[PDB]
Design a protein around this ligand. Structure first.
Ligand code: PRP
Ligand code: PRP
Ligand code: MG
Ligand code: MG
Lengths: 178, 176
């Protein structure tokens, strides 16, 4: 697919970052090339509409790199975007959830009024690795009694089996790397 | 301006967050109401086109809340968006710049821009101007020309606009 090629050709892979042995998939060039960014958002939007029709109520974007994609994706679908943030950043009543990140623990947080019970959400982030981040997002959304229809990303690192961590919540990525 | 009203009426104010005495201006409802978000992006884009014509090469979005506006504004203008991040997140050779927040640092890849390229920086909120000022420093060290900085919200009592001078600044909404 030519649209997909526009995205794939703008991922830049850095070896041994942030640790020896790991390859970092840099999405910066996708952002920098407006045709590449437009293609990425279009491909995600087409998958979501083809899969869920009118069922999606909101997109949820994940702090921080997921913020690059959430609002544009929401806009393309005619939807609003809600935020899930690293803990400590949101005012008002919140819920939070730990997850393992690198060698330690981090927490995500959501405003308690971000969604109402029964609302249907799709979560977007730039990249799925271990799945810890996306899994925490799903936990939070579940605790608001929201229904997570699907999680999506630009990049998926398939050897880390993040998709399995999210099951039974469906997952879709544009691009896959070991 | 009813477009501007679509944005203003979706700012939510929280006293004493994160510290007693201040009022936090929460942009979350702007992002949640697609009409409000579209209005904000449209007002910013119209201002920038009216001020710079075709001279803007790139938008630079500031980690993290500025990431919510950078790509959409860039797309509206037909431009790419470059990233300025909190230090420690970017691969490859980088430059960084400290500012008072304790201390924090922003960072940019050395190859983010070429000398002479013209940039507009976007963030959600201008307060002291420390974050925006650090971004301008970084872009200047790449020999990029910062045409303007913009935000949705400006806290005027903190005099951030003056901190950035002579770089022009524009905000949609102003609060003390
Ligand atoms: O699937 P996982 O193993 O949880 O990793 C994926 C997450 O890691 C990165 O975020 P990071 O915490 O590095 O922060 P950033 O979004 O600020 O870059 C990335 O943006 C994803 O959110
Ligand atoms: O003008 P200043 O006094 O520098 O304050 C403005 C900055 O503060 C907030 O960012 P914050 O560092 O709180 O991080 P966030 O973007 O992750 O919310 C806001 O998003 C601006 O970037
Ligand atoms: Mg992330
Ligand atoms: Mg910020």
């Amino acid at each position: 697919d030519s649209e997909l090629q526009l995205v794939e050709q703008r991922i830049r892979s850095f070896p041994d970052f942030p640790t020896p042995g790991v390859v970092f998939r840099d999405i910066s060039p996708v952002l920098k090339d407006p045709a590449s960014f437009r293609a990425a958002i279009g491909l995600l939007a087409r998958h979501l509409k083809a899969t869920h029709g009118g069922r999606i109520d909101y997109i949820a974007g994940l702090d921080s790199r997921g913020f690059l994609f959430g609002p544009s994706l929401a806009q393309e679908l005619g939807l609003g975007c809600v935020l899930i943030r690293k803990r400590g950043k949101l005012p008002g009543p919140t819920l939070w959830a730990s997850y393992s990140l690198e060698f330690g623990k981090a927490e995500l947080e959501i405003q308690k009024d971000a969604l109402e019970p029964g609302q249907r959400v799709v979560v977007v982030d730039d990249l799925l690795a271990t799945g810890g981040t996306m899994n925490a997002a799903c936990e939070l959304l579940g605790r608001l009694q929201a229904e997570v229809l699907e999680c999506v990303s630009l990049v998926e690192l398939t050897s880390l089996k993040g998709r399995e961590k999210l099951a039974p919540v469906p997952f879709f990525s544009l691009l896959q790397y070991e």
